[model samples]
Every structure is written in structure tokens, then in C-alpha cells.
Target chain A: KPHRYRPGTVALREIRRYQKSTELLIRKLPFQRLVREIAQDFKTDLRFQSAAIGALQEAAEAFLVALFEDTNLCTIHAKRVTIFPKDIQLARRIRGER
Target chain B: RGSRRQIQRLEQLLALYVAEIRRLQEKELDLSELDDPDSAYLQEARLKRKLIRLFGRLCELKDCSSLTGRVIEQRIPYRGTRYPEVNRRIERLINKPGPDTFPDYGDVLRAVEKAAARHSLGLPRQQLQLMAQDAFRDVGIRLQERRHLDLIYNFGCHLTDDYRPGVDPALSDPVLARRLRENRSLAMSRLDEVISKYAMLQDKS
Candidate 1:
């Protein structure tokens, strides 16, 4: 239940992964792509009620922030400035994800 | 791409051909019914020819783009050739073609004489014509390197008619297609040994 990255991690990580100093989120592949990819990875048209859409959004937002945080931590672990696929992947590993 | 799709189809067809071949290996590759070294090799040779025939048919079907239909039990029908003094079935159609592109007596004759010499036919040349068809009957022969190579080339030439490959050249299994056009001396019997020799290779259908 509370297993995923303590809640606001993924989105924050995603935002910070692009511009650490920016006031707004980064762009390009789009947050929509990220959300869609995640949803596509796990879904069911059945989850259309109370604990569905908002739960997913919050979870996604949490994952993105955590992803960036752990992603950056791994970058630091790798002695680098920016996060990359490998760093995020290691982050996922330590954070117990894919 | 049509070419990629062609490759997938060709790959699928070859795979199907080989799978079916392996499956029938148990029931059909009965060396006991086969006699001597010649008999064993003969059966293997027949099966190899069958593989080519099935491959050609699968290809024909692919051209039409509907593998969803029936996949009946099809076998390569080898012909009997009483050539060079008689009493033998020395040659056959590698990829048995339809009646329209059926190989003439001339091509079969050439393949037979050459095959006879290669297999060291002990029969005399004068008796070649008088040789009974029964001697050349459904009896399979040695699955030699030359024969295997010939079958691929034979099928390639036989299939390249008024039509083209089912897909684009880019996505084709050129090696498989080329085997029907030009073949080298490759022995199908040694397949198991090759797999055993290579660790990465699994003996899969």
C-alpha cells in the first residue's frame, strides 16, 4: 500500500532531473508521456471510481520526485552532475522498483 | 516495412518447415525400414527433400499472406529415377513444384546422371534407359552434401517464376532464398553435431 517512494517523489525527481534551479517543471518528452507510459504499464478500465485517477496522479507525482531524488543520489554515487538512465535505474533498484 | 515483414514471414516459414521436419523425424526417420548405410542415408535424404518441398509450399502460401488456413500433413514426394544401368532411385525433385513448373525429363535426367556418378554408380551407361522405374521408385538415397546443396538451389530456381517473393527484398531471408538458387556442400545430418559443438546453440525447432 505505502510501498511506493513515500508519495511525492517521482514527479519531483522528474522535474529536478531536468533543471535543479528552475521554478517550473522541465519539458520535452512531456509529463503526459510519463503518465501514459506508467498507466500503460499497469491498468484496468475497471478502476474508474473513488481510488482511481487521483490516486494514480498522486502516486505518479510521488514517484517522479522520488525518482529524481534517488536518481540524483545515484548520480552522486556515480560521481556525476546530472542523472541518467543508469542512475535512475539504480535508484529504482535500491528503491525496489523496475 | 514490407521487406521486414517479408523477413518475418520467411523466418516463420523456415521455422515451420524445420519444426515439422523434426517432429516427423521420430515416426518417419525409421532407419530400420531403411536398408544398409544407403538405406539410412536414403531416408534422411528423402526427409531433407521433403523439407525443401514443404518450404516451397510454405513460401507459396506466404505470397498469398494467409498462414491462418490449414497446415495439413504435407510430405515431399521424391521421384524414382532408374538411371545409369538401372536398379536405383538416384535423383528426385528437391522442391517438388506444381505441374505448371514441373521439372522436365531433361533436368531430372541431368541431375540423375550427375548424381549417379557422384554416388559412384556401379551400373553401366548403356543400361540407363532400359532401367525399370521400380528401381528408381520411392526409395530414398544418401543424404549427401551435394544433394542438400542442390535441393536449395533447385527450389530457388523452381520458385522464381512469373511472381516475386511474398515481401520486399530488404526483409527477406536471403540465405534461405539463396539456398534455393545457389547452395554449397552443407550436410543436414551433421546438424546435431554442430549444435553440440556450439554452446550458445540450442537444438530448437
Candidate 2:
């Protein structure tokens, strides 16, 4: 229950308060990979330009940040040491990211 | 600010971002890149690499080539840094004495490695290895004493189960007793070879 959260502001603030205890915790969003995937998926369809890269990056970052909530859910309630595919689905569900 | 401030603080202290920590550990971030990123000439190259790693969900590595070294150097007295793998191996082999196929040097080596890891606080590899040898030697010293008593009891009573009040046997079953003595001598030489080899290795090191 300590780790479980309702996605409340207090939970967000609490998460933010933890100073860098380990360098690993600060990994940034993988926008390059995400953008490439976006490009590859849209290659045969609508051609995207440089302008779209920013939006892709932003969306990529948002999703990366958002997944922490779901990751914590899986970490605690599930008491799992490693992340699983099902955990991602649950994250997507919680973040409303079909 | 929660329904219970006390519990909230406890969670904040205990859980303080563990999932993310594990997830981050799953990465291989290269920190040496951050040394001079703004050098203008390498801007594009740096951008490409950082973005690549970033897109790969990596952290901005802060030139940690000496991180472990620095960590070890700064350690205080008594307590040691825990090597997760080494400690786990130690727990596994501490009681499960295997056959004497080459001294279980692997076990001894790993015990040393664990010490090296735990005591990395700036100690050289040889010293760490020696410390490992020192620590693991005790794991069996007491056992050896117990076994010595057994050997004495066996030579006297004939049957190993007949442990008496030191009615020590040294003659009569003389040949067998002498054979047991010789066997013990052979085993001692082989076992001593371990410490001898390590000492030699320490010298070479």
C-alpha cells in the first residue's frame, strides 16, 4: 500500500522529492528510438517532416514519464523484480494510451 | 498532506522510487560522453549520440570512470560495500563443501572477489584476494578441528561410530592407523597446496 498510488498530486510530489539516489534512476526518454519507430511505421503512409520530430519527442517524453506510475504499480502490488510485458499493458491502460 | 502523514513519510523514505531504480539499472549508459559536449566541433556528433541513447532510454552519464574507485576510497571503517553476486555465492558455498577437485579455488576465488567487491574501498586486488582467503579459511578451520577429533577417535576405536573418551589408537591396527596417518598427510599436503599456492600468487602479485 505504501507504493500504491491513486495518481494523486501528493503521490506525484512524493515521487518528485526523492533526490538522485542512483544515477540509473535518471534515464531520459528514448525519443530517438521512438521517433525512428514512428518514422518507420509512417514511411509508406503520410510523410512526416522535421516539425513532427518535436511533437514525437514531446509525446515520447510524456509517455516515458507517465509509465513510472504504472511501473510502480507493478513493482509494488506485484512485488516483481523485473518489469514484464503485462506491466506495460497495464501502464498503457492506466495512462489511457491505448 | 495524506490521510496519514506518518505513513506517507515512511513510504516516501522506504519506497522512494524503487521501480524506476531497477528499470534504470537495466540500461548501459555511457557517461564519459558528458565530459565536453559543448565543444562546438563535436556538437552534432554529441547530439546524435545523446539522442540515440536518450531514445534508447539511457541516462546522461556523468563521466563515472572512477566512480567505483572513488566510492571504495571513501568507505569508513568496519562495514563494507556488498557485492550482490559475491555475497550470494558465499552464502551458497559456505556449508556445501565440495570434493577436493583442485581446492575449490573457484569458491576461494569468488570469496576473494566478494571481498574485493565489498571492500573495493580502494584496496588492491591482491590484498582483497588475501582478505578473501583469510575470511574463507575460517569457514572450515572449526570443521577441520572437529574432523581431527573424528580421526583420532576412529584410529583408536576401529569403528568410526565408537567414539570413546580418547582411548586413542596408535598401534595394533598399526598398518591401518599408519595408512590413515599417511592419508591424512597426503590430504594435508594437497590442502596446504591451496594456501601455499595463494601465498605464492600473492607474492607474484
Candidate 3:
């Protein structure tokens, strides 16, 4: 098992190298082209392998929408369906709207 | 040229310097007063402050001396920017079905007022609400398509049975389809209200 509390050691040079690599990769492509390429790759790869592809596509769609589009799409609610005075009161307590 | 032993000695000295700084900071924190000349805390505080100043100086020195000095010298600042339209579109697509996309009925009521103003038509709140609901239903269908995509990605290409570990087997059972439909309706209703409230706020701004 990993130690519960330990001062983690990192090589700064290695981290810098990784960052440089990421920058290089992003700089090599335009965003629109990258998106198109990714979509094309998914369609071709997922077509023959339906079940696995379907699962991956679903996750990608949700992730893309959530990450790139809007975080507001996510929600949490109580199981109870009936609205009462208390329900309205409870709504006031939830923070960060719109 | 420096020997391996010389490099090891330098490393040890650097380690000691860092450890000393940590110890001094702790000592300074323990004492309440900074004015006591006799207090080791005062000396420790001074030493720790010096260490931090030296650390900053060392960074500048390294940047100047490094091969990537020119690249490192260039400074760029990032000003946070937001894409509200993209965010709105994404939020709308995530939620399913109608009216519940907005956070509350009041938001739908407000939109109806706006539409009435634009068209110069005296439409009742109920009629506007129904129109919003219908629009939401169309959006909901689109959301469902995305949800199907999500399910595929998350579950892979495995049969629904394979998802038994994460989801209830009964959820996909043909007999429980009605219950699932009801659950989905409830979920979409809640989501519609949320998105509507979000959209209303964005419009106001």
C-alpha cells in the first residue's frame, strides 16, 4: 500500500519536458481540424466494433458536452417528487445558480 | 573539473540550507513578538526571510544563465475569458425533454413575457409555457441522442448485461421499460428547469 502521508518528490525537469511536449502537440494543429479528425477517427474505429465503440462514444459525447460546452447540464435533486413549502425553502440553500 | 565528491558535498550543503530555512520559519511562528532581540525566533525569522529572497534571486540567476534563457525571459499573462454562448448551447444539449431545462417555472414565465413584447401579441402565460415546453421536447430528443452516445462510450460495446456491475440489470429489462420511461421523464423535467434558469440569467446579462 502507498504511504498515507508522504511528501511527494517530483523531477521538475521531467515535468517541464512533458509540458513542452504538450505545447508542441497543440501548436501543430488547428482546433477545428483536430475536432474533425477526432470525430472521423471515432466513426471509423467505432463502426465495426459497435458495443465497445458505443460505450466510448457515449462517454466522449457526454465528456465533450460537459467539459467544452457547459457544466450547467449537470444536476442533483432529491428523490421525492412532491413540491412543498419546505422544498421551496430548501432550494434557497443551494448555492451557485445560472 | 569538479569531482563526484564535490558535487555530493554541494548537494548536502543545499539540503542543509533548505532544512535550516524550514526550522527557522517554525521557530518564528512559535513566538508572538518580533521585537525581542534575545529571541532565537527573531533570528530564525530573519534567516527564513533571507532564504526566500535568495531563492527568488537564484531563480532569476538560473533563468538568465540557462540555454533557454531567451525563451524563459519572455513573459506572457493570461486574462481569463469565457465563452457564454458555447456554454449555453452545451448546457441546453445536456438536459433532456422539456420545461424542466430551466431552473424554475418563473424563468419560463419571464420568457413568455419577452416573446409577447416582441410579437405585440397578448399571449397568456399558459400558452407561452406550452410553447416553451414543446421547444424543450425537441431539444430533449437531441439530448437523448447524445445520451445514447454517452452510454456507448461509458459502457463500451458490451451487451447491456455487461453493465450489471455499474447499473441495475432490472433497469434495462423489457418489463421495467415503463418505469424507466417515467424516471427519464422526471430527470428531464428537473434538467429543463435548471437550463432555463441558466439561460435566463445569461440573457439578463
Candidate 4:
């Protein structure tokens, strides 16, 4: 069901905070030079880039979901405020539709 | 361009240095198990020679990449700027490698002596050698794991944050962000375990 009312004001703030923290955490993790070299070479490739972004979204969602769920809030209600990017084109292609 | 090439060279040198250190560590581990008295001289001499070579290479790499930290700092505006601090720290560590900083085999032996003297644990030379081997192996694993995790996490963060609005949001999803966090936590936990275990062993010995 659609959200009964506009999402809470805190939803946007929470999302922003979540994104910022995720970015900070990601900035500190490590990888090898070879891996970095390869990533640099293919960084612009659409498929690779999309997948990478999707991973981050999932991470953010998981973190937020955990936070909300831990508060005993209904996950369905929480979902209305949490925005997730849908792979609409991919889904359509998989279903053999335009 | 010069900075990029220098960073690349530093990376190569670092890799080679780590590989050599691993080889020496493996040999030391093998030497620890040998019971033959004649092997003692051979093991000690080999360890000493490898220690000297390792120290020398470390110094050479430091000299060669003296500007690595600065180069990395300048690149903070480039495609991968989030890792500059970590890169700089790593450069500093490698650039300042020495017995005092990175406890060599002789230092390990001395530690063992000090422990024995303080605790009367009767740690023999062979035991000290084994302890050194274990310590090196632990350190090597931790360093590599940390470097790899930092690279991955930082790259992921850079893709998300450094690039402007035209940047692909898909590359910086919340999923990848959480995974990076989880991976980092795991790496830290592993390193902590290794360090604590070694410390406990040292104290017990």
C-alpha cells in the first residue's frame, strides 16, 4: 500500500546520514594495487558501474533496515520512507518486454 | 604524470619487499622446527643476512619514494582521493622502516631474552626463533589484509563521494557501503585476534 501521508521529515535526514557514514566507512577500507588498476580501467563501464552502485544501495538499505527494525518499528511502514532504486530496465528485459 | 609513475613504482617496490619478507619468514618458520645443532649456525646466519637485506631494501624503497605521501596528498583532487591519508600513512611506515620500528629477528631474540630474564620462562634460542617467525607471519598477514581492505573500501567510497553530481549513483549504493563496513570490521577483528594472541603468548612465555 502507498504511504498514508508524506514520509516523515526524519526520513530524509536519516537517509543522508546513512549515506554519509557509509561513504566514510568505504573510504577507509583497503584493496590491492592490481585491483585498483583494474577498477580504474573499467570504472566507466555501465554494467560494472551500475552493479557497484547497487551494492552500495543495498548496504545502505541493510543498515537502515537494521536500525529501524531494531527499534521494533514495522518494517513495512519503514519501507515507505526508505527509497530504493529499482532495476526496472533489467527487469523488463528479463521478462522479454520492451 | 611523474607522481603516478612514482606511486606505481612505490607499489611495485612495496610488493617485492613484502614478498621477500614472506620468504624470509617462511624460512625462519622451517628453521624453528629443526633440532640438529649444526643447523643452528646456518639458520642464524641466514636469518641475519635476510634481516640485513630486508632492512636495506626497506630503506632503499623509502628513499626512492620519499615524495609518495606528498604525491598522494596532491592527488586528493583526483579520481581517487579518499585514500590519501591511508596511502600517506603507509608511505610513512615503509619510508621509516627500521629495527626499532619494525622489530627485526635480533629484536625478537632480545624480546625473548628479556621475557626469559623477567619471568624465568626458560625460552631457548629455538623457541625465540619460532616466536619471531610467528610474529612476522602474523604481521605480514595483517599488513596485507589491511592494505587490501583499505583499498577496496576507499575505492568504493571514492566512487560514491569524490565524483561530482554527474557521477553514477549506482556505483555508490548503500549495499556496497554496508558490505565495505562489514568487511572492514572483519579485517579489524582478525588483526585484533592475531595481535592479542601473540601478546598473550609473549606474556605466558
First chain TM-score for all predictions: 0.41, 0.40, 0.23, 0.26
TM-scores for chain B, listed for all candidates: 0.25, 0.27, 0.23, 0.26
Flag the better candidate by DockQ, 1 or 2: 2
Cα lDDT tens digits, model 3, A1-98, are: 21121101222332222222222212222322333355565563322222222223334444443332122222222221444333332343342122
- Model 1, A1-98: lDDT tens digits are 11121111112222111111111233312432344444454652311211122223334444465455444333311112544454455555664242
Full-model lDDT for every candidate: 0.35, 0.37, 0.36, 0.35
Best by lDDT: 2
Candidate that would win on DockQ? 3
lDDT of 4 by residue, B28-59 (tens): 21212222333322333333344334333433
Q: Is candidate 2 or candidate 3 better by DockQ?
A: 3
Tens-place lDDT digits, model 2, residues B35-81: 22332213322333332332222111221121111111121121122
The C-alpha stretches of model 3 lying farther than 4 A from their native spots are: A1-98, B1-109, B154-205
When summed lDDT is taken over every stretch of 10 residues in candidate 4 chain B, the lowest stretch is: B70-79
Reference-based TM-score of each model: 0.19, 0.21, 0.21, 0.21
Per-candidate interface DockQ score: 0.01, 0.01, 0.04, 0.01
Cα error, residue A62 of model 4, in Å, equals 31
Error of 4 at B146 (Å): 2.2
> What is candidate 3's lDDT per residue for B90-199, written digit by digit as tens?
34333433212323333323444464656566666566556544443334345434444423332321134345454765666976877787888987668657655655
